């Protein structure tokens, strides 16, 4: 069961996939390859909830039904360097304009 994700930090969004059976730790290894920060310098979140490295993505509620190619689920990302922890902060995307009269 593939799961499709947006990993978001500040004004950065990574599109990637994993399995429901993938661990949170294994997702950090995916992020490491892209962003070059090791798993122990990463914190991953689902909404406000800090995710436990050992738990599977499925156990955290990312399923093939909630994390779809055309509507991926969001994972928050924050970094740590030594004793300094960054807080989770995700900049929202822009907003569409008013719906035109003839729609």
């Amino acid at each position: 069961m593939d799961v499709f994700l947006m990993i978001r930090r500040h004004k950065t969004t990574i599109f990637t996939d994993a399995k429901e059976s993938s661990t949170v730790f294994e997702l950090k290894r995916i992020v490491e390859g892209i962003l070059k920060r090791p798993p122990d310098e990463q914190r991953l979140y689902k909404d406000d909830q800090l995710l436990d490295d050992g738990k599977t993505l499925g156990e955290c509620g990312f399923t093939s039904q909630t994390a779809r190619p055309q509507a991926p689920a969001t994972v928050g990302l924050a970094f740590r360097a030594d004793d300094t922890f960054e807080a989770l902060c995700i900049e929202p995307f822009s907003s569409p304009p008013e719906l035109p009269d003839v729609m």
């Binding site: 593939d2 499709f4 947006m6 004004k11 950065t12 969004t13 990574i14 599109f15 990637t16 996939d17 892209i34 779809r68 190619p69 055309q70 509507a71 991926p72 900049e91 995307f93 822009s94 907003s95 569409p96 304009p97 719906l99 035109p100 729609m103």
Partner: protein
Amino acid sequence: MYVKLISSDGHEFIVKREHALTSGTIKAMLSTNEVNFREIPSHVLSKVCMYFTYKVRYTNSSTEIPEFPIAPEIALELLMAANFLDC
């Protein structure tokens, strides 16, 4: 290989190179592994990246394919993006 696609308002989208190459326009712009769009905003470009994931996953797949959803409020700018991107 990942590429970085940057929206008009500065949001960075990191996507598989194979996925971004769905668009011949992006392929040309890549010829850095980053592409700056001058008029595609983040809410549209994020929807375009979902399309790429959908297209690559469901192409050649010989399974039941779900609809690609588009909300009314985004449809007209997404159309313009799709036309520009030829995807």
